[PDB]
Amino acid sequence: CTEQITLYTTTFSPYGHRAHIALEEAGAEYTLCQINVHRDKPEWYKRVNPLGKVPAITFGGPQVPPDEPSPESEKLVESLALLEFVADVFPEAKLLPASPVQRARARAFIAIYQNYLHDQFRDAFFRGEPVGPFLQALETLQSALPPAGFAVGEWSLAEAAVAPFLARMMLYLDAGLGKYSEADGETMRAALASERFARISQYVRDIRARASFVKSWGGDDVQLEAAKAI
Amino acid sequence: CTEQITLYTTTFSPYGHRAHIALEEAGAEYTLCQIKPEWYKRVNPLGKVPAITFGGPQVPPDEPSPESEKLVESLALLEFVADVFPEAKLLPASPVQRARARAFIAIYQNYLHDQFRDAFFRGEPVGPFLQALETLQSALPPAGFAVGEWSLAEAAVAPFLARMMLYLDAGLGKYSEADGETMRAALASERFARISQYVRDIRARASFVKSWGGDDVQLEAAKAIPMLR
Ligand SMILES: O=C(c1ccccc1)c1ccc(O)cc1O
Ligand SMILES: O=C(c1ccccc1)c1ccc(O)cc1O
Ligand SMILES: [Mg+2]
C-alpha cells in the first residue's frame, strides 16, 4: 500500500487498540493520532466523523497533520471492520489465515467474544452486576481455543479483536479496579489463578508477549493510570 | 470451488436465511437441510444453527461426514462464502468499499438488531426501534444497496428487515396495538421511505426470492411463533 493511513482513537481505547494492533501486525506505514478521552474532542474531528464515533481511520488523500484531516481521504469506523480493512489493504501480512475455513474460525472466535464475553466485561466491570456470567463467558471463549497458540493457531485478527479487552481484564483484576463487590473481585481473581482458567491465562500471557501488542499497549502502568481516570 | 457445501438451518431461520442468500448470490452448488434431530450433534455438538459443512465426501445432510469442516456464526458464514467464491464479488473489490459493507452490518447489529427484538418480541417501547431503523437507513446511499451493488450487507440484513415488514403488515408482534399503529404509520411515512424501498429492492432480488419462502410460507411460519403474540 501507498495510500496514507491515519488511525484516530481516543487514548488507550481498546477498540482503537484493536486497529493499532493490526496496523503494527500489518507492517503498515501509518500515523497515530490520539484524542484525550476526557476533553470534548476537537472541533476539527467532525471532519473525521460527524458523530464523533471512535475509533476511525482516514485513508488516502494528501499527507496532512491529523488535526487537519483532508476532506479527500476516505474515513472509516467500526473497530472490527477496521481490522478486516487492514487485512484487505495488507493481504501479504496474512492478518487472517489463508484458507476460507481458517478465516471463518478466526471470525467465529471473535463472534464468541462479541456474543458472550464482551457484554459481561461491561456488566461485571462497569455496571457491577453478578460476575457469574462473566466467568462463564470467559470459560466459553476459552473452550474455543486450541490447546496451545492462538485462536486459529497463528496470530490473527481474532487476537487483535480480543486482546485489548482480555488484557485490560487481567490488568483491572490484578489491580482491583471495577464496580464489582470485594467478594466478586476475590472470586474473579481466584478463578483466574485456578486451573480452570489456565488456558485463558496462557492465551493472555502469549498475547502480551506479541510485539504488536507491546508497542500498542505502552506498558501496564500507563493503562492503569488511564483506567483509574474512568 | 469443488468442495461439497451443506447449509443447515431451521426452516424459517433468518440467520440461516443469511447464509442461504449468500450461497445463491455465489452460484454455489450446495445442499440445503432444514429441520432437533439426534444426528445434528455431528454437525455441531452445541446444536448451533445455522451451520455449514464444507468438504469431505458427498453425503446426505442427515449423515454428515467426520471429514467435513463444520462452521457456525451467520456472519462468519457470510464472509466464508465470499472467501470461497471470490469471483461472485459477494463483497465489493476495494478495501474501503468492503469496509463500508461491513460497517453497515455493524450498524444493523449494534443499533437495530436488538431493538427489533425488544419491539416485536418483548413488547417493549417502540421508540428506540424506529430511531435505529432511521439510523440504518441513513447509512444507505440514496439508491442501490448499502455499498452500491448487492453485498453481504444485504445477505446479512435482508432476512430481518423482510421479516419486520411482514410482521408489521400482518400485525404480528408483542407490541401494543398502539405501538403497532405507530410503527405501521411510520414505515408508510416519508421518514422511512428510503428503507421501505430498500426492502422492496431486496425482495425483488432473485437470491432473496428463492431463499424467502414466499410471504405465504413465512406468514404461516410467523403465526406459529409464540413471541409474536
Ligand atoms: O461474526 C462476527 C460477529 C459476530 C457477533 C458480533 C460481532 C461480530 C464477525 C466478527 C469479526 C469479523 O472480522 C467478522 C465477523 O463476521
Ligand atoms: O464490524 C463488524 C461488526 C461490528 C459489530 C457487530 C457485528 C459485526 C463486521 C460485520 C460483518 C462482517 O463480515 C465483519 C465485521 O467486522
Ligand atoms: Mg448482564
Author numbering:
A (entry chain B): 3 to 232
B (entry chain A): 3 to 37, 43 to 236
Provide the authors' original text about this structure.
To further explore this issue, we have conducted biochemical and crystallographic studies on the interactions of six GSTOs from T. versicolor with chemical libraries. The six TvGSTOs (named TvGSTO1S to TvGSTO6S) used in this study are representatives of the twelve TvGSTOs that have a catalytic serine, while four others have a cysteine instead. In this study, we demonstrated at the biochemical and structural level that T. versicolor GSTs that belong to the Omega class interact with polyphenolic compounds found in wood, and in particular with flavonoids such as dihydrowogonin and naringenin. The ability of TvGSTOs to bind polyphenols through different sites suggests that fungal GSTs could be involved in the transport of various polyphenols.
Indeed, a few compounds significantly increased the stability of TvGSTO1S, 3S and 6S, i.e. they show a variation of the denaturation temperature ∆Td > 5 °C. On the contrary, most chemical compounds induced a destabilizing effect on TvGSTO5S and 2S (∆Td < 0 °C), whereas the chemical library had little impact on TvGSTO4S thermal stability. As shown with TSA, other TvGSTO isoforms also interact with HBPs, each with its own selectivity. The alignment of the solved structures with the sequences of TvGSTO1S, −2S, −4S and −5S shows variations at the putative H- and L-sites, which could explain the isoform-specific TSA patterns.
